[PDB]
Structure formats: structure tokens, C-alpha cells
């Protein structure tokens, strides 16, 4: 009768990224749930690190610099530098557009 209350997940974005990296490969429901949980966990980790960074520096705003430092502190080695490059590219493009 009544539709279930909507529950937001990262399924469609993960599917788009998968189609970008593997046009012919699909994904199962359990794997999609695992990917969604991974995204949530990484988001929580980075956001908590950025919040702690802002608190340590007596700042009231989380900006690109705080997230970038959180990424450098949380991701190991090549993952950190590649994520930094991708994020700086995205921020530069976003500020270049509007």
C-alpha cells in the first residue's frame, strides 16, 4: 500500500564509477552494500579527522585544507598523494566554473 521510507545510499554513484572503470562488469547486492559501507566509513573517518583538526586549531569551519590534511593523515602512501591530486583537481575545476 504505502511505499517504504526512502533510504539514501551511494549505489548509483558506485555503479557509475564501476561503469567508468569497467564498462562490462556488474555488481551484486552484497558487494554494493559493502561498497556503500566502505564509503560511509571513509567519509566518517575523514570528517572526524577534519573536525579534530579544526578543533585543534581553534577554527569554526571545515575547508578544503582541513579535509586535505585529514586525507594525508588517514590514507597511506600513494593513496594519499593520488587522492590529494584528484581532490585539488576537482576543487580547481569547481572554482574555475563557478
Amino acid at each position: 500500500k504505502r511505499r517504504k521510507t526512502r533510504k539514501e545510499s551511494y549505489a548509483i554513484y558506485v555503479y557509475k564509477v564501476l561503469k567508468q572503470v569497467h564498462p562490462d562488469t556488474g555488481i551484486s547486492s552484497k558487494a554494493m552494500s559493502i561498497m556503500n559501507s566502505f564509503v560511509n566509513d571513509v567519509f566518517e573517518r575523514i570528517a572526524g579527522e577534519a573536525s579534530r583538526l579544526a578543533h585543534y586549531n581553534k577554527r569554526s569551519t571545515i575547508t578544503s585544507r582541513e579535509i586535505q590534511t585529514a586525507v594525508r593523515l588517514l590514507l597511506p602512501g600513494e593513496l594519499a598523494k593520488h587522492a590529494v591530486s584528484e581532490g585539488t583537481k576537482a576543487v580547481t575545476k569547481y572554482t574555475s566554473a563557478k
Binding site: 539514501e8 551511494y10 554513484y13 558506485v14 557509475k16 564509477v17 564501476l18 567508468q20 572503470v21 569497467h22 562490462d24 562488469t25 556488474g26 555488481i27 551484486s28 552484497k30 558487494a31 559493502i34 561498497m35 566502505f38 564509503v39 566509513d41 571513509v42 567519509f43 575523514i46 570528517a47 572526524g48 577534519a50 573536525s51 579544526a54 577554527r59 569554526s60 569551519t61 571545515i62 575547508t63 578544503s64 582541513e66 579535509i67 586535505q68 586525507v71 588517514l74 590514507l75 597511506p76 602512501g77 600513494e78 593513496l79 593520488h82 587522492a83 584528484e86 581532490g87 585539488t88 583537481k89 576537482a90 576543487v91 575545476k93 569547481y94 572554482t95 566554473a97 563557478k98
Partner: protein, 103 residues
Amino acid sequence: KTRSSRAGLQFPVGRVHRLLRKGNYAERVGAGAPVYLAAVLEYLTAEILELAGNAARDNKKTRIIPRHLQLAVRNDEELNKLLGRVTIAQGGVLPNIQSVLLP
């Protein structure tokens, strides 16, 4: 026009911004912070999905299953370090047999 399209990202910049605002992390959230976080999340997802797709193709499968994700995570050194204390359901373990136990 979505903020994800401006940054050339597939992850939702607006949803990340709303979660940052409503996540009790700071009094204010910058404009570029959700863009940067969405880019990082998209990159990590792309890395794991690429490795999992490689594993699936190596196992003659076209759909990624938890076993492929577990293999991808534990075969990549940095990804294994990032998810060291993370358990993937139905992922199993790697085929590792100690050399002393072999015949």
C-alpha cells in the same frame, strides 16, 4: 546544474555537503570541502572497483561479489593497510599455506 557536474565528479557533492553540515563536525562547512571529499571518495571507490573487476575477470565472472572485493583489498598493500581492521562479509581469506606445512 549539479555541483558534481561542475567539479567533474560522479559522487554527490550536495549530499556530502549536507552530511557534513548535519554530521556535527564543525559550526561551518566550506564550499570546496564537499568537492574535495567527493573527489577522494570517488577515487577510492574507483581504485577498489578496478581491482575487484580485475579479480572478477580473473575468476571468469562478470559480476563483482564480496570475494572479489576481499581479494582486491587484501592483495593491494595500501588498501590492506587502510582496511586492516575491517571485516568484509562473505569475503573469505587468501589462499596462504605456510611453507613448513607443505609436503
